[PDB]
Write an enzyme that holds these catalytic residues in place. Structure first.
Site, PDB file in Angstrom:
ATOM      1  N   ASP A 180     -12.159  32.989   8.095  1.00  0.00           N
ATOM      2  CA  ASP A 180     -11.326  33.886   7.305  1.00  0.00           C
ATOM      3  C   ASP A 180     -12.178  34.835   6.467  1.00  0.00           C
ATOM      4  O   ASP A 180     -13.143  34.418   5.828  1.00  0.00           O
ATOM      5  CB  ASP A 180     -10.387  33.086   6.400  1.00  0.00           C
ATOM      6  CG  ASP A 180     -11.134  32.260   5.371  1.00  0.00           C
ATOM      7  OD1 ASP A 180     -11.662  31.190   5.736  1.00  0.00           O
ATOM      8  OD2 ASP A 180     -11.192  32.682   4.197  1.00  0.00           O
ATOM      9  N   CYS A 214      -3.602  35.945  12.893  1.00  0.00           N
ATOM     10  CA  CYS A 214      -4.331  34.956  12.108  1.00  0.00           C
ATOM     11  C   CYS A 214      -3.451  34.363  11.013  1.00  0.00           C
ATOM     12  O   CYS A 214      -2.426  33.742  11.295  1.00  0.00           O
ATOM     13  CB  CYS A 214      -5.586  35.578  11.493  1.00  0.00           C
ATOM     14  SG  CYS A 214      -5.395  37.306  10.995  1.00  0.00           S
ATOM     15  N   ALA A 216      -2.728  36.314   7.654  1.00  0.00           N
ATOM     16  CA  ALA A 216      -1.955  37.464   7.187  1.00  0.00           C
ATOM     17  C   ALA A 216      -1.606  38.430   8.326  1.00  0.00           C
ATOM     18  O   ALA A 216      -0.723  39.274   8.175  1.00  0.00           O
ATOM     19  CB  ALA A 216      -2.727  38.204   6.101  1.00  0.00           C
ATOM     20  N   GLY A 217      -2.305  38.311   9.451  1.00  0.00           N
ATOM     21  CA  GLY A 217      -2.045  39.178  10.589  1.00  0.00           C
ATOM     22  C   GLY A 217      -2.633  40.579  10.491  1.00  0.00           C
ATOM     23  O   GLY A 217      -2.116  41.505  11.113  1.00  0.00           O
ATOM     24  N   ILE A 218      -3.704  40.755   9.722  1.00  0.00           N
ATOM     25  CA  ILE A 218      -4.300  42.082   9.600  1.00  0.00           C
ATOM     26  C   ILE A 218      -5.819  42.124   9.645  1.00  0.00           C
ATOM     27  O   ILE A 218      -6.385  43.065  10.192  1.00  0.00           O
ATOM     28  CB  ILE A 218      -3.825  42.815   8.304  1.00  0.00           C
ATOM     29  CG1 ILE A 218      -4.217  42.021   7.056  1.00  0.00           C
ATOM     30  CG2 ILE A 218      -2.316  42.995   8.332  1.00  0.00           C
ATOM     31  CD1 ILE A 218      -3.760  42.669   5.747  1.00  0.00           C
ATOM     32  N   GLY A 219      -6.479  41.115   9.077  1.00  0.00           N
ATOM     33  CA  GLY A 219      -7.932  41.098   9.058  1.00  0.00           C
ATOM     34  C   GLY A 219      -8.531  40.789  10.417  1.00  0.00           C
ATOM     35  O   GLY A 219      -8.973  41.683  11.140  1.00  0.00           O
ATOM     36  N   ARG A 220      -8.559  39.507  10.755  1.00  0.00           N
ATOM     37  CA  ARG A 220      -9.083  39.068  12.037  1.00  0.00           C
ATOM     38  C   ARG A 220      -8.271  39.655  13.202  1.00  0.00           C
ATOM     39  O   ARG A 220      -8.840  40.071  14.204  1.00  0.00           O
ATOM     40  CB  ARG A 220      -9.087  37.539  12.080  1.00  0.00           C
ATOM     41  CG  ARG A 220     -10.153  36.928  11.176  1.00  0.00           C
ATOM     42  CD  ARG A 220     -10.044  35.414  11.099  1.00  0.00           C
ATOM     43  NE  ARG A 220      -8.994  34.997  10.175  1.00  0.00           N
ATOM     44  CZ  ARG A 220      -8.771  33.735   9.814  1.00  0.00           C
ATOM     45  NH1 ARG A 220      -9.523  32.753  10.300  1.00  0.00           N
ATOM     46  NH2 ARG A 220      -7.801  33.456   8.958  1.00  0.00           N
ATOM     47  N   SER A 221      -6.948  39.690  13.067  1.00  0.00           N
ATOM     48  CA  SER A 221      -6.100  40.255  14.116  1.00  0.00           C
ATOM     49  C   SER A 221      -6.449  41.734  14.318  1.00  0.00           C
ATOM     50  O   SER A 221      -6.556  42.201  15.447  1.00  0.00           O
ATOM     51  CB  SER A 221      -4.619  40.125  13.747  1.00  0.00           C
ATOM     52  OG  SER A 221      -4.191  38.769  13.738  1.00  0.00           O
ATOM     53  N   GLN A 261     -10.140  43.628   7.305  1.00  0.00           N
ATOM     54  CA  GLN A 261     -10.100  43.328   5.879  1.00  0.00           C
ATOM     55  C   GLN A 261     -11.378  43.786   5.184  1.00  0.00           C
ATOM     56  O   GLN A 261     -11.349  44.211   4.028  1.00  0.00           O
ATOM     57  CB  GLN A 261      -9.887  41.830   5.654  1.00  0.00           C
ATOM     58  CG  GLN A 261      -8.776  41.502   4.669  1.00  0.00           C
ATOM     59  CD  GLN A 261      -8.896  42.284   3.375  1.00  0.00           C
ATOM     60  OE1 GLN A 261      -9.815  42.065   2.586  1.00  0.00           O
ATOM     61  NE2 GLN A 261      -7.964  43.204   3.151  1.00  0.00           N
TER      62      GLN A 261
END
Ligand SMILES: CC1(C)CC(Nc2cccc(-c3sc(C(=O)O)c(OCC(=O)O)c3Br)c2)CC(C)(C)C1
Length: 297
Positions: A180, A214, A216-221, A261
């Site tokens: 993360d 992931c 929050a659905g924004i960083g890794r995704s 992110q």
């Protein structure tokens, strides 16, 4: 050109500035539905919401809201659904979305528990004998098989619409070692995983958009999707120099806020695309190289 830009940014150590520039120019659209009082418990994070214009609507009269966005890359001609880690009360919704959107694959880039905290509900069955039934959405989910590797696991699911008794196979790609707020251990391990998803047929235009999540659905995704899209754009034109990564990221951000992110996730995106470009342009050995370097066995 990305390779020259990367070395230039790396030489001047200005990835933070480059990343902040993206945040400054990023699109801003309303998320009124996500912010309605009744949907408060359908959002994992107060500040991460899908824009109204691209949010995925559940096909139900009661409440169609889910925290998920349809990232439709027109030029690349590939779509993705980015969503949050399903909550204990939204697992039925999650699978209703997968069914209605006709997705064939689900990419999970996070672990259920990360840093002491629970980033996602247990929304798939862990044992063949204990299938899951989501009464609220009338769907049954059964674990058919699973191929466990050192850093990722691929799961064969069977999703049943209990109402029509129709059955579909869903491929679950679980990336289990992507920290993360962090980056994959290497471009090789990331690419090996992405190609696993690609080679499953899950990204084909003949199926609905692949679901990517992931926490929050924004960083890794966001990192995962940016890399895949850039390689695709490059592939269709067979010209690596024609891809403007930052421009692609900003295009993506018109559909979901906050994509990628950190500055290092962005830097890693360049790394992955540059390396992946070798395959695109007809190197037949890197794929096996990545597999070896990934240490999946
Ligand atoms: C600039 C800013 C204010 C920053 C803000 N950050 C912001 C706000 C609320 C939650 C998050 C999180 S929490 C989290 C996790 O796994 O715990 C994340 O995943 C990490 C990962 O997948 O790598 C992200 Br991403 C980030 C997000 C919005 C879009 C509000 C813009």
């Amino acid at each position: 050109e990305m390779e020259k830009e990367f070395e230039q940014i790396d030489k001047s150590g200005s990835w933070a500035a480059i990343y902040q520039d993206i945040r400054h120019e990023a699109s801003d659209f309303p998320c009124r539905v996500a912010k309605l009082p009744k949907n408060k418990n359908r959002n994992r994070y107060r500040d991460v919401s899908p824009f109204d214009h691209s949010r995925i609507k559940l096909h139900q009269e009661d409440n169609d809201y889910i925290n998920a966005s349809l990232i439709k890359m027109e030029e690349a001609q590939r779509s993705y659904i980015l969503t949050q880690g399903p909550l204990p009360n939204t697992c039925g919704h999650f699978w209703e979305m997968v069914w209605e959107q006709k997705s064939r694959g689900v990419v999970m880039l996070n672990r259920v528990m990360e840093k002491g905290s629970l980033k996602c509900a247990q929304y798939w069955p862990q044992k063949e004998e204990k299938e899951m039934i989501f009464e609220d959405t009338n769907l049954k989910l059964t674990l058919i098989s699973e191929d466990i590797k050192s850093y990722y696991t691929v799961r064969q699911l069977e999703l049943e619409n209990l109402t029509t008794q129709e059955t579909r196979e869903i491929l679950h790609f679980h990336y289990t070692t992507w920290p993360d707020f962090g980056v994959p251990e290497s471009p090789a391990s990331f690419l090996n995983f992405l190609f696993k998803v690609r080679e499953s047929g899950s990204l084909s235009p003949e199926h609905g958009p692949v679901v990517v999540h992931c926490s929050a659905g924004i960083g890794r995704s966001g990192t995962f999707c940016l890399a895949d899209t850039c390689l695709l754009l490059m592939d269709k034109r067979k010209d690596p120099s024609s891809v403007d990564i930052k421009k692609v990221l900003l295009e993506m951000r018109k559909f979901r806020m906050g994509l990628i992110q950190t500055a290092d996730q962005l830097r890693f995106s360049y790394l992955a695309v540059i390396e992946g470009a070798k395959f695109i342009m007809g190197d037949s050995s890197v794929q096996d190289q990545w597999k070896e370097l990934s240490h999946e066995d």
